[PDB]
Structure 1
Amino acid sequence: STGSATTTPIDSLDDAYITPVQIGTPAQTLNLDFDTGSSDLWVFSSETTASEVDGQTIYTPSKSTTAKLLSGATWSISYGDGSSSSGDVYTDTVSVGGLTVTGQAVESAKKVSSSFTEDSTIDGLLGLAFSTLNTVSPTQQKTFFDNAKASLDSPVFTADLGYHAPGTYNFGFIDTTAYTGSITYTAVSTKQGFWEWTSTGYAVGSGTFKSTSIDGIADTGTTLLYLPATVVSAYWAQVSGAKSSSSVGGYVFPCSATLPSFTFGVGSARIVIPGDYIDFGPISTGSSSCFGGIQSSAGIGINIFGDVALKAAFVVFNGATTPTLGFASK
C-alpha cells in the first residue's frame, strides 16, 4: 500500500505545516502537525478541558463506531519548545492520504498547554520519530508509520515541505518526479529515538565549504534550523546589523537586509537553503527588526534540522531494518 497527503503551511511564515488525517468511523478529519521529532499521535478531543479549546477541530470518540478505549492507558508529553499535553487513549482507524491503519493509538487530550490552545490551526500532532519515544503508559504504543510499515510497498516515508507553499508527505514510495539529481543517503542513529544523522559541514552564501561533522536530528515539527553557536555566528556575521538579542531570544537582523544562503552537507552532496527561507519576519507587528531562521542550539543539547533546512530538500525517512535518511535537491 501507499499514501500521499498534501501538507500546508499554517501561516505566511511557514511556522508549521498541517496535514489532514481521517480518524474513526465515519471519518473525522483533523489537521495534524506531522512531527518526525516525536512519537505520539494526539488530538484535541471532546475530552479536552473546554477553556483550552479555541477553534480547533476535535475528535469525538463516542461518535466513532470503531473507537475503543485503551483501558488504563494515559499519556503526557513535553516538547522542546516548552509546550505540553496529556490525556487518555483510544484505538481507532486512522488514514493518511489513502493509507489506512486499524487499531492505531489515538491519544485524546484532556489538557493542553497555552501555546496549543492559542494555535487554532493545529488539531494535534502525528509523531513520526521512533516508537521508543512514545509516552503512553503503562503499555507504550506504536507510531502510525510503525503500524503501517509492513503493509507499505517500501518501508519509507518522504517529506517534501514547501516554502510559502503546500508540499507533500508520501508513505510507501519515493516519487522520482519530486526532486532533481540523486538522493544521497546517510546513516541514522536511533539511540535517542530520533532520526539522528551527521551533516558533513556547511557554507555561508558563496563562501567556501567548511568540512565539519554536525550531529543533529531531522525534525519536521521544529520550525527553525538550530546549529552550534560557532556555525550560527559565522552565518549572521555576513548580515550587516545582525545581532543576538537575549531579550528577543535569538538572532535578529534588519528587515531591510538581503540574507545569504546557507548550505549543509549530506555526505559529498550539498543542500542549499536560499536566504529568503531564513527570514521569519518582524519580531513584533510593525517592527523593522526581523527574526532569524538559523539559531543557536547551545543549551538545547542537540542540533535540529527543522523546517528551514528540510523544506530546501526532498527528504526520505527510510525505515528499513537499519534506518537511513536521504536528501535530494528539488
Structure 2
Amino acid sequence: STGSATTTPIDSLDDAYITPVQIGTPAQTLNLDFDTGSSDLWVFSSETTASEVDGQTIYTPSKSTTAKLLSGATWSISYGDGSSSSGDVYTDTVSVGGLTVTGQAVESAKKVSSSFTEDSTIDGLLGLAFSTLNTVSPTQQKTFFDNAKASLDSPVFTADLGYHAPGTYNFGFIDTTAYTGSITYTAVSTKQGFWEWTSTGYAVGSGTFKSTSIDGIADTGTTLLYLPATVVSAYWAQVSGAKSSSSVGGYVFPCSATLPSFTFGVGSARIVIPGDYIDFGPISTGSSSCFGGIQSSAGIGINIFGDVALKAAFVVFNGATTPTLGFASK
C-alpha cells in the first residue's frame, strides 16, 4: 500500500505546513503538522480544556465507532520552542493520503500551551521521528510510520515541501518525477531518537566549499536552518547590511538585499538553498528589515536542518532496519 497527501504552509512565511489526516470512523479530518523531530501524534479533542481551544478542529472520540481508550496511558510533551501539552490516549483508525493504519495511538490533549491555542491552523501534530521519543507512559506507542511499515510497498516516506507553495508527503514509494538527478543517501544515527546525520560541509554563494562535519537533525517541524555560530557568521558576512539583533533574536538584514545562496554537502553531493529561501520575511509588516532564515544553533544545543533547508530538496526518509536519509535537488 501507499499514501499521498498534499501539505500546505500555514501562512505566507512558510512558518510550518499542515497535512490533512482522517481519524476515526466515520472519518474526522484534522489538519496536522507533520513533525520529523518528535514521535507523538496528538490532537485537540473534545477533552481539551475549553478555554484553551481558539478556532481548531477537534477530534471527538465518542463519535468514532473504531476508537478504543488505551487505559492507564497518559502522555506529556514539551518542545524546543517551549510549547507543551498532555492528556490521555485512544487507539483508532488513521488515514493519510489514502494509506490507512488501524489501532494507531491517537494522543488526546486534555491541556495545550498558549502557542498551540493561538495557532488556529494546526489541529495537532503527527510525529515521524523514531518511536523511542514517544512520550506515552507507561508503555511507549509507535509512530504512524512505524505502524504502516508492514503494509508499505517500500518502508519509506518522502517530504517534498514547497517554497510559498503546497507540497507532498508520500508514503511507501519514491516519485521519480518529483526530483532532478539522483538521490544521495547518507547514514542516520538513531542514538538520540532523531533523523540525525552529518553534513560533509558548506559553501556560501559562489565561494569555496569547506569540508567540515556538521552533525544535525532533519526536522520538518522546525522553520529555520540552525547551524554552528561560525558557519552562520561566515554566511551573513557576505550580506552588507546584515547584523545580529538582540532585540529580535537573530540575524536581520535589509529586505532590499539579494541574499547569496547557501550550499550544504551530503556525502559527495551538494544541495543548494536559494538566496530567496533564506529571506524569511520582514520583522514587521511594512518594515524595511527582514529576518534571516539561517541562524546560530549555539543556544539550541543541536544543529537543525529545518524547513528552510528541506524545502530546497526532495528528502527521502528511509526507515529500513538500518535507516538512511536521501537528498536530491528538485
State the TM-score bracket (shorter-chain normalisation): over 0.9
Q: Tell me what 2:22 maps to.
A: 22
Q: Tell me what 1:122 maps to.
A: 122
How far apart are residue 286 of structure 1 and its match? 2.4
CA distance in 1, matches of 2:277, 2:119: 22
1:262 aligns with 2:262: yes
How far apart are residue 207 of structure 1 and its match? 1.0
How far apart are residue 115 of structure 1 and its match? 0.8
How far apart are residue 281 of structure 1 and its match? 1.1
Instruction: Please list every run of 5 or more consecutive structure 1 residues that lacks an aligned counterpart in the other structure.
Output: none
How far apart are residue 279 of structure 1 and its match? 1.1
CA distance in 2, matches of 1:261, 1:81: 27
Deviations 1:65-88 (A, max 9, x none): 001111011111111111111111
How far apart are residue 113 of structure 1 and its match? 0.8
CA distance in 1, matches of 2:51, 2:284: 26
How far apart are residue 255 of structure 1 and its match? 1.2
Deviations 1:286-330 (A, max 9, x none): 221111100000021100000000000000000001000000000
- In structure 2, the residue corresponding to 1:151 is in which secondary structure? coil
CA distance in 2, matches of 1:109, 1:289: 38
How far apart are residue 178 of structure 1 and its match? 0.6
- In structure 2, the residue corresponding to 1:190 is in which secondary structure? coil
- In structure 1, the residue corresponding to 2:235 is in which secondary structure? helix
Deviations 1:127-171 (A, max 9, x none): 000000000011100000000011101000000000010000000
CA distance in 2, matches of 1:259, 1:58: 41
- In structure 2, the residue corresponding to 1:146 is in which secondary structure? helix
CA distance in 1, matches of 2:113, 2:205: 39
Deviations 1:58-112 (A, max 9, x none): 0000000001111011111111111111111000000000100000000011111
Deviations 1:152-193 (A, max 9, x none): 010000000000100000000011111000000000000000
CA distance in 1, matches of 2:49, 2:243: 41
CA distance in 1, matches of 2:274, 2:86: 38
Instruction: Please list every run of 5 or more consecutive structure 2 residues that lacks an aligned counterpart in the other structure.
Output: none
- In structure 1, the residue corresponding to 2:145 is in which secondary structure? helix
Aligned length: 330
How far apart are residue 285 of structure 1 and its match? 2.5
- In structure 2, the residue corresponding to 1:327 is in which secondary structure? strand
Over the matched positions of the two proteins, sequence identity in percent amounts to 100
Q: CA RMSD in A?
A: 0.6
TM-score normalised to the size of structure 1? 0.99
Runs of 4+ deviating beyond 3 Å: none
How far apart are residue 247 of structure 1 and its match? 1.4
How far apart are residue 284 of structure 1 and its match? 1.9
CA distance in 2, matches of 1:284, 1:45: 33
Q: Tell me what 2:140 maps to.
A: 140
CA distance in 1, matches of 2:119, 2:275: 27
- In structure 2, the residue corresponding to 1:309 is in which secondary structure? helix
CA distance in 1, matches of 2:213, 2:293: 21
- In structure 2, the residue corresponding to 1:77 is in which secondary structure? strand
How far apart are residue 210 of structure 1 and its match? 0.8
Q: Tell me what 2:193 maps to.
A: 193
How far apart are residue 282 of structure 1 and its match? 1.3
CA distance in 1, matches of 2:244, 2:27: 47
CA distance in 2, matches of 1:45, 1:236: 44
The farther-off stretch of 181-190 and 109-118 is 109-118
